Amino acid sequence: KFMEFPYVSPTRKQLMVDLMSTVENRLQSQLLPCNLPPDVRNFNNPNGSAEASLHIRSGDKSSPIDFVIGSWIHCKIPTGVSLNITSISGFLNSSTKAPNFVVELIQSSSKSLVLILDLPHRKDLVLNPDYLKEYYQDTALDSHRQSLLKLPEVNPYVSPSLFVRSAVSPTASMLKIDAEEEDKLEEILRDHVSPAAKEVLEVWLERCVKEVVGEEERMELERRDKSFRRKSIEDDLDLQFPRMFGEEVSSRVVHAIKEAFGV
Amino acid sequence: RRKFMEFPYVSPTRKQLMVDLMSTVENRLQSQLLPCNLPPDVRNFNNPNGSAEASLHIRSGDKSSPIDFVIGSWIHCKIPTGVSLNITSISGFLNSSTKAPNFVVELIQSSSKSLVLILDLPHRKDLVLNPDYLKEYYQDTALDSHRQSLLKLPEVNPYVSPSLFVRSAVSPTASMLKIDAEEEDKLEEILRDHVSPAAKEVLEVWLERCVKEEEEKIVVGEEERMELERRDKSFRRKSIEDDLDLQFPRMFGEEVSSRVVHAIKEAFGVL
Ligand code: NA
Ligand code: NA
Question: Which parts form a coiled-coil structure per UniProt (chain A)?
Answer without folding.
Answer: 205-231
